[model samples]
Target: PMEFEWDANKAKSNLRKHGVRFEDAVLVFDDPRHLSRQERYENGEYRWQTLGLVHGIVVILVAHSVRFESGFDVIRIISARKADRKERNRYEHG
Candidate 1:
């Protein structure tokens, strides 16, 4: 787990940490191959932040390994949730 920890630390450190002082949203680093010592700044301002090692790597590696399962799962999940809600409501009154 040492590598994972190091990667996580590096990712967290490279995260973009800035906002309009009152904004509730912050940018995130989504690149799959950003090094631990890598980061980007715009006009010396923050733009995005990275996450853990597994997530980025999985997003890049495992995701592309599949031929066509990228976006289909998300849509399927959303539709399943909606269908479940509708079907379950038929038995329970609330």
Candidate 2:
């Protein structure tokens, strides 16, 4: 488990909307092999895209921003959802 710092209301809201639990999300290190997609911010934060299979009904796409503070790693969820068919297909292809 990792320490995460994000808007609780937003996170819980997204969790309910996406039908995914906190346990489903995992931290992806700054490694190519470990990430399906990633980006580095000018502000020294890392953004990651991770696929979470919750109930086999939705392919939850979670995008979160992470940074280090006070010697601890924290993640702030940007968004989480199974987008439209086109968007989902793009993720599948790439």
Candidate 3:
């Protein structure tokens, strides 16, 4: 909903888990061809899922949440990872 922001702890953890950076994750937001066909939620908290090619190559999938805090909306990155076979297939064939 607004500028991108992410928890420092999660950022580090995400890096270890997926080798993807939150800084690079935002590139997905800038991707005009990015896919955003599905919505997500858990226990009443809504989340968003996106798949886009970053660095004009790898398809990284990002999970984020737009929440209002300290006065405005922030796109808080939850996690990200390199797209798997199926995800890349969709990105390529779509």
Candidate 4:
């Protein structure tokens, strides 16, 4: 397992910007075993997908990207949130 510190500002900003809760933000990292999918980028950013209950009302699907720290021991999240219904369905069926 990798160790990392949560960036409070980025988490808060993502919450406010995407209307998702902080608890849901941590879900993507805490429980990655059930990942729906993942995407790789040329810029060294790897994005992962999962389901989250945003505010306990909405069944939100979250995608988050992280950057590994030196030595690949830690990771810092770059962004996270729901994307679209199509993406969600794709994850569900495909």
* Winning candidate number (TM-score): 3
Better of 3 and 4 by lDDT: 3
Error of 3 at 5 (Å): 1.3
Higher-scoring candidate on lDDT, 1 or 4: 4
Q: Mind sharing the TM-score for model 4?
A: 0.53
Local error of candidate 3 at residue 39 (angstroms): 3.6
Every model: Cα RMSD to truth? 17.7, 4.7, 2.7, 4.0
Q: How many backbone clashes does candidate 2 have?
A: 0
Misplaced by over 4 Å in model 4 are 29-33, 36-73
In candidate 1, stretches whose alpha carbon ends up further than 4 angstroms from where it belongs are 1-35, 47-51, 54-94
**Candidate 2: pairs in clash:** none
Instruction: Residues 1-94, candidate 2: write the lDDT tens digits.
Output: 3476667687688778876554455433322323246766836798877654444445556788778778677776766766467656754565
What ranking of all candidate models by lDDT puts the best one first? 3, 2, 4, 1
lDDT of 2: 0.61
State candidate 3's TM-score: 0.80
Poorest 10 consecutive residues of model 4 by lDDT? 27-36
Q: For candidate 3, what is the lDDT?
A: 0.84
Least accurate 10 contiguous residues by lDDT in model 2: 26-35
Q: Write one digit per residue (lDDT tens) for candidate 4, span 6-57.
A: 6688778978888765556555544433345576663676666556444444
Q: For model 3, how does the per-residue alpha-carbon lDDT over 1-94 read when each residue is reduced to its tens digit?
A: 3689888999999999899999999899899888865476654445888899999878999998766667667676889999999988887787
Name the runs in model 3 displaced over 4 angstroms. 41-45, 68-73
| Model 4, position 54: C-alpha lDDT score | 43
